[PDB]
Design a protein around this ligand. Structure first.
Ligand code: 4K4
Ligand code: 4K4
Length: 112
């Protein structure tokens, strides 16, 4: 009921984050970090709980999220992992912040 409706809002946000109008800055978050492929041989020493939008999408499709808060927690974990790993002046941090602005402003419109 209310929870289904809230997760519908989450699915709409997720669709938007994956949409072409944000693709120029959303792309680092589309898939799990392949640390070896990117040469980030310290990534898994620093980041204990990787997260990315394709994993959020699979969990949404599979009904893993019991409420909107767990969905939001995973999206914020993905952004926090990016802020944890990188210097504050890094290009990817600016990209994360722009996509997080999109996320937080629409998440705040949650029906209640
Ligand atoms: C698998 O996704 C990646 C692709 C590429 C790559 O080959 N590119 C970059 C994007 C470009 N596309 C852009 C969109 N366009 C529609 C199609 C073409 C094509 C050329 C480069 C990196 C990719 N993955 C990626 N994962 C996690 C990172 C990270 N980078 N950012 C940039 C980081 C960089 C350094 C240190 C940390 C990170 C990081 O935090 N994340 C989340
Ligand atoms: C480590 O970070 C990057 C790496 C590469 C790259 O050449 N790769 C990484 C992906 C590729 N792997 C794929 C799988 N395979 C096993 C082999 C390894 C190997 C070659 C390319 C881009 C990287 N980071 C990056 N950050 C911000 C951008 C930007 N570019 N530019 C290029 C953009 C490209 C498209 C749209 C926007 C941007 C952009 O604005 N920024 C700021």
């Amino acid at each position: 009921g209310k929870l289904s409706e809230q997760l519908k809002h989450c699915n709409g946000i997720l669709k938007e984050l994956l949409s072409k109008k944000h693709a120029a800055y959303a792309w680092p978050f589309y898939k799990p970090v392949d640390a070896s492929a990117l040469g980030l041989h310290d990534y898994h020493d620093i980041i204990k709980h990787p997260m990315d939008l394709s994993t959020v999408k699979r969990k949404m499709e599979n009904r893993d999220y019991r409420d909107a808060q767990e969905f939001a927690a995973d999206v914020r974990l993905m952004f926090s992992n990016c802020y944890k790993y990188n210097p504050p002046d890094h290009d990817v941090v600016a990209m994360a912040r722009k996509l997080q602005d999109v996320f937080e402003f629409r998440y705040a419109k949650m029906p209640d």
